[PDB]
RNA sequence: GGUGCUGGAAGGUUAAGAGGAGCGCUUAGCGUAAGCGAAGGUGCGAAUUGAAGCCCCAGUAAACGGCGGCCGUAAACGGUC
């Protein structure tokens, strides 16, 4: 609304993916029966399910 | 903003009173005719001065008084008179 105070989206509860580590990326996906893409998806920021 | 109250004349409007230009009426006399006419007297009095007040400028609402309409958008915000 306009004069409202902006509230900002949303945290999508991840880890940023880039100059992460090459150690964090492996250490909370926790892949075990084969969601990988979604895994993906929704355990990083921003990343489409083409990127996956 | 308008009206009241208070303050301010830069500029106009200003009455009575001062002021007297000038213009009529009479005639001692100039005049063949019709008119002109000095000094007085008697009416109209133009310019120039002549305060408050009014127009104006500011403040004052526990002074008088007033605090709107249409169209959208989800009280609030946007467009217009």
């Not at 989206?9 to 880039?18: E, G, H, R, T, V």
């Given at each position: 609304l306009p004069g409202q105070d902006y509230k900002l989206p949303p945290a999508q509860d991840k880890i940023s993916p880039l100059?992460?580590?090459?150690?964090?990326?492996?250490?909370?996906?926790?892949?075990q029966?084969?969601?990988?893409?979604k895994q993906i998806v929704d355990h990083f920021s921003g990343v489409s399910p083409?990127?996956?």
């Amino acid at each position: 609304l306009p004069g409202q105070d902006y509230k900002l989206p949303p945290a999508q509860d991840k880890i940023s993916p880039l100059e992460a580590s090459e150690d964090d990326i492996l250490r909370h996906l926790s892949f075990q029966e084969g969601r990988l893409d979604k895994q993906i998806v929704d355990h990083f920021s921003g990343v489409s399910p083409l990127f996956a």
